[PDB]
Amino acid sequence: GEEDLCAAFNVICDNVGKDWRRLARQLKVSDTKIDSIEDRYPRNLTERVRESLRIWKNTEKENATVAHLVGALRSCQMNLVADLVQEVQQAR
Template sequence: MDRFLVLLHSVSTGLSSSELTELKFLCQGRVSKRKLERVQSGVELFSVLLEQNELDGERTELLRELLVSLRRQDLLRRLDEYEAGAAGRAPPEEQDLYAAFDIICDQVGRDWRRLARQLKVPDTKIDAIEVKYPRNLTEQVRESLRVWKNTAQEDATLPHLVAALRACQLNLVADLIEEGQQAQGLQNENEISSSSGSLMSWDSNTPASRAFS
């Protein structure tokens, strides 16, 4: 079953009629008036957005923007859990980057503008982020990191991010990221070692007659 569709269904069931009306209002620039008039549920609204390629499992920015406008932190947490699951299926270097994003969102606070400029995020984008999430500092930080990642593409690496933090004198945050990366590396080594040990133990317990048959 598609995890993103499950998420959209879960969000839809959590919406009140007044919240659905608000979402329809916010989608006026994306969905025709005729289609919006026929929408009677969150599922129907999300189906229209999916059909129009305004939304998909890899592009959740619009869904996040809509949920932020409703100030539904419970639904935003569900989206965070979905995105964390998607990050878990990403390559290891991207997983490290997503983990660093979480630390930065928790630690950087209002210094995010300085970090964004160090990462070469344009001032116009920074202003737009503040307008988009006027009362949600965490989303301002996370959105600035998303913009950087999407713009820098292959240059959006963990070493680049740590260097930018240190250039902004945010050394504690940089240290936390590096410590987390080292801890994850040790955990991976222990898991590999444990797995190898289990295989050796199984081999040693295999009867000779079976081993050479």
């Protein structure tokens, strides 16, 4: 539910970087927002990402499942991260 998504955000936030925006789009996050996010946290790449995810969790209160998160990660080739995200979700 809630802490599960937390643990996943932490692995993702500290691991994506570069193609964060690619990820944003996959999570069906309007660029109207992605724009803003670049704006608000020009400083840390880690914050921007997280934020990205947050918007995603607020877009679907009930369907915000790690499933989809891993699904988002793998369509963008961020396999190694969806993998880790999956092994931390299995251990919990």
